[PDB]
Design a protein around this ligand. Structure first.
Ligand SMILES: Cc1cc2nc3c(=O)[nH]c(=O)nc-3n(C[C@H](O)[C@H](O)[C@H](O)COP(=O)(O)OP(=O)(O)OC[C@H]3O[C@@H](n4cnc5c(N)ncnc54)[C@H](O)[C@@H]3O)c2cc1C
Ligand SMILES: [Hg+2]
Length: 363
């Protein structure tokens, strides 16, 4: 028998949404346990491009995100993320806000061959592994590696969970397990809220010759043709990580070589002044985990649902993790749930941190 535990809020899943919420709750005086079955940040989060989007009824929530995340890096934000690494102070639009010129242009667009125009946004780009590291620090002793989860009932009521045979009692249980939310819901005998999986086929290029770039390339059409972010590697090279429309439906249908070949064509057109002849190339397939369209959604918002003492959801964007936290805290607030008194947590087995794919795919 492992030592039984007691807290206020028990969170399942240590990606950005669970970790951010955990940090908010602890800051507000709640006791928590956060349960992760693999590595923290290791589903979608560390695989994101790290861009904090900010672009109004439903669309209000997203618009305020860059300001909110920025605040956290200083003295007066909703979390203490001071000393978290930004990859870039700005993300850019790139066409054929501020119009950027001369040495205000991103390094990769300073070339004389750069025709067309770039626009600087308030949007920010975070080093996600370093973000996750800090949120794990803010978690303190709440963090628990646990693989196998069962419900802990009191009649029909959900009193907590049994994690690797350990009973953990809690006033609420929150499922922030990404793609794992579906099977956890089934484990509780639930089928709502339903989940969808929208795959991406992301491309990574690694070379010594790359110059920093954080941008959506627009042709015609609302959506980015490609989305570039630059990621430094431990050995002193960089990696350009490519999302956008190249990583969507037709990218998904292309195999690795066809997807790489498509990526080479497009970089030769858009950034011909950067020699990729010595570059290494890889791709990455990953599913976005979202509420199904069959749920009651507001689009540019986090999604949350509940059944009894169970709260469950998805941020939809990494950007919107603070909105996911707000939605949980307003339920707690409306329901009158306050911090109670609990024994200190013992020593617990701790989940590992995830590495970014650019360190694993080449190194
Ligand atoms: C390629 C890509 C690029 C993206 N780029 C951006 C971007 O630039 N900007 C932006 O705002 N958003 C972006 N997103 C969206 C963003 O990544 C997600 O919305 C967000 O990271 C999801 O956070 P999460 O914590 O809900 O999910 P996850 O990060 O998937 O975390 C879920 C966690 O739960 C754990 N878990 C699963 N099952 C169980 C279980 N049974 N028991 C215990 N733990 C479990 C997992 O191991 C995982 O760590 C991107 C997504 C992808 C796929
Ligand atoms: Hg472009």
């Amino acid at each position: 028998m492992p030592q039984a535990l007691s807290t206020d809020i028990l969170i399942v899943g240590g990606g950005i949404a669970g970790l951010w919420l955990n940090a908010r709750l602890r800051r507000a005086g709640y006791a928590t346990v956060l349960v992760e079955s693999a590595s923290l940040g290791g589903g979608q989060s560390v695989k994101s491009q790290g861009i904090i989007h900010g672009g109004t009824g439903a669309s209000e929530a997203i618009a305020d995100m860059p300001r909110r995340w920025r605040a956290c890096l200083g003295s007066d934000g909703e979390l203490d993320l001071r000393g978290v690494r930004l990859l870039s102070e700005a993300h850019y639009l790139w066409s054929p806000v501020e119009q950027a010129k001369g040495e205000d242009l991103p390094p990769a667009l300073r070339d004389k061959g750069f025709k067309g125009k770039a626009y600087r946004l308030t949007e920010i780009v975070f080093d996600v592994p370093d973000l996750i590291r800090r949120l794990a620090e803010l978690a303190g002793d709440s963090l628990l590696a646990g693989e196998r989860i069962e419900p802990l009932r009191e009649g029909r009521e959900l009193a907590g969970l049994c994690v690797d045979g350990r009973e953990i009692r809690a006033q609420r249980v929150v499922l922030s397990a990404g793609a794992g939310n579906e099977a956890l819901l089934r484990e509780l005998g639930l089928e709502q809220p339903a989940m969808q999986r929208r795959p991406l086929h992301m491309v990574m290029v690694k070379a010594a010759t790359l110059k920093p770039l954080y941008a959506h390339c627009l042709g015609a059409g609302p959506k980015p043709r490609i989305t570039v972010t630059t990621h430094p590697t431990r050995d002193g090279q960089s990696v350009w990580y490519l999302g956008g429309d190249i990583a969507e439906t037709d990218g998904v249908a292309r195999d690795e070589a066809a997807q790489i070949a498509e990526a080479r064509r497009e970089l030769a057109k858009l950034l011909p002044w950067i020699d990729l002849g010595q570059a290494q190339w890889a791709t990455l397939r990953v599913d976005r985990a979202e509420p199904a369209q069959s749920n009651l959604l507001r689009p540019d918002n986090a999604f949350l649902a509940e059944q009894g003492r169970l709260l469950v959801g998805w941020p939809t964007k990494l950007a919107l993790a603070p909105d996911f936290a707000d939605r949980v805290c307003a339920r707690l607030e409306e329901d009158g749930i306050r911090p109670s008194e609990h024994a200190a947590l013992p020593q617990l087995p701790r989940p590992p941190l995830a590495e970014p794919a650019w360190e694993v795919a080449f190194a």
